[PDB]
Amino acid sequence: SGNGAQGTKFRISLGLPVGAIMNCADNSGARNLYIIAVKGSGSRLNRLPAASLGDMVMATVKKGKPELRKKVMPAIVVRQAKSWRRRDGVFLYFEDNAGVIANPKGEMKGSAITGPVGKECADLWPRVASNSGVVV
């Protein structure tokens, strides 16, 4: 999260610890996103930096366009599966864990986003608002 996201993310249960690998939801060449850290997250010996909806994580590409391989870029978590809960009282979960590679300024690299997307995330990044179809 943080830089370039206007808005504020109410806490939702983390579900993506470092090393998790999540479906790439856009069309940049990237197929999967493997998480190496989570901006914002803090310190407590032996905790694993975990991420949730509309979090921003440094990631790599394990499967995809050999030009998107072997290097590190930011990305944005857009689908969950670890049942979180909103203030509206409901517990909800997606089918996969999914992201869309992005620049630090929260900007996409992709043309659009395949699959549904968390609203908690939409409100967070204006350009994820754009390229998303079905939201939440």
């Binding site: 808005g7 504020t8 109410f10 407590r44 010996l45 032996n46 203030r87 509206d88 009282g89 409100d123």
Partner: protein, 386 residues
């Protein structure tokens, strides 16, 4: 040597020792400030946690992504039938501290409170408060000066009230007696308010109001003897380790050559007193009121009592408090609720909340139906029935 990786300790030394508490009735260690200028009234109340339920209400946090939106919050509900005033106490400043100077008790006394002053009731001759009940016979005289003594001196004044436990579905009988500070004007005006209420009755709506910040005071649920791991949030030792892993590996360093006070050990988890602050009342319901559960929006006639009753408690027939969230201690326990010790400008407090819907569906399962009305209306008719 020094650590290797600094990381914060476990537990909170402010809560030591971690012994069993010396009575189920946690103690009002402190009372609100006093401004003798408002009317005289009580500063707390005695209760019985019935359980919790859920609430839906709109929100008024001008700024938040949930401003003017519905949210669903959990709320406990304490059984709170009118306490009854039966004695008065004046205390005094003394270079050693405060000191009880006298009590003065009412004339007649409910077997509910008489119960309290005993251990084998049924057998005894129940002589408690009979020579005291005398002192009224003669005109009053003694009782007079006693009250009169209080006024002349007494820097503070507290009421001896007691729960009407009979109206509570508990099996207990033995009611709960306690002192309560009085925070209204003039000590002399205070004792009058006291005297005037002997034998008589005080209700919650005269101590507490909707949306007001209150603090709970009770003895925590208990869990008996506890491994170091759960009692202190201690890291599990790894799997390979001989002789147990729910421990601490280094119980201490060499010198100073003793196990210290600051290091966790296995002990009694639970049954501690806690003062819990800043809970807000969401409903101050009346027992001579059908459809407590109803709301301005809901409307359907229903008491708060969930289908098939509150699990493990009873049926809530009297007046009650409903507080946003959860409360120290468990169901059927004697709980004190107390006026807060500072006025909060919290915005988050002062928010004048208004319930929309109150879950009446049974908590003995995955309940679907609030009213048997709603139930019979949906499933149709069955092999018993009409």
């Amino acid at each position: 040597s020094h650590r290797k990786y600094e990381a914060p300790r476990h537990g909170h030394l402010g809560f030591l020792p971690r012994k069993r508490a010396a009575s189920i009735r946690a103690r009002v260690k402190a009372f609100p400030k006093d401004d003798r200028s408002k009317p005289v009234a009580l500063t707390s109340f005695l209760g019985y946690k019935a359980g919790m339920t859920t609430i839906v209400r709109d929100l008024d946090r001008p700024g938040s992504k949930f401003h003017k939106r519905e949210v669903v919050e959990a709320v406990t509900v304490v059984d709170t039938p009118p306490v009854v005033v039966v004695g008065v106490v004046g205390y005094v400043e003394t270079p050693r501290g405060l000191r009880s100077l006298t009590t003065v008790w009412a004339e007649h006394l409910s077997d509910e409170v008489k119960r309290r002053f005993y251990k084998n009731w049924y057998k005894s001759k129940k002589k408690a408060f009979t020579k005291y009940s005398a002192k009224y016979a003669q005109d009053g005289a003694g009782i007079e000066r006693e009250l009169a003594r209080i006024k002349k001196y007494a820097s503070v004044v507290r009421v001896l009230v007691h729960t009407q436990i009979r109206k509570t579905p508990l099996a207990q009988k033995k009611a709960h007696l306690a002192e309560i500070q009085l925070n209204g004007g003039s000590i002399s005006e205070k004792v009058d308010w006291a005297r005037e209420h002997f034998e008589k009755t005080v209700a919650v709506d005269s101590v507490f109001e909707q949306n007001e910040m209150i603090d709970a005071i009770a003895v925590t649920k208990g869990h008996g003897f506890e491994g170091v791991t759960h009692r202190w949030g201690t890291k599990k030792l790894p799997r390979k380790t001989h002789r147990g892993l729910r421990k601490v590996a280094c119980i201490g360093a060499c010198h100073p050559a003793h196990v210290m006070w600051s290091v966790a050990r296995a002990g009694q988890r639970g049954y501690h007193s806690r003062t819990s602050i800043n809970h807000k009342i969401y409903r101050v319901g009346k027992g001579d009121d059908e459809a407590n559960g109803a709301t301005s929006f809901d409307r359907t006639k229903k008491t708060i009592t969930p289908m098939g009753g509150f699990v493990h408690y009873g049926e809530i027939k009297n007046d009650f408090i409903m507080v946003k969230g959860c409360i120290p201690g468990n169901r059927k326990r004697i709980v004190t609720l107390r006026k807060s010790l500072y006025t909060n400008t919290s915005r988050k407090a002062l928010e004048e909340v208004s319930l929309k819907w109150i879950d009446t569906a049974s908590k003995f399962g995955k309940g679907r139906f609030q009213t048997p009305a709603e139930k019979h209306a949906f499933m149709g008719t069955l092999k018993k029935d009409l």
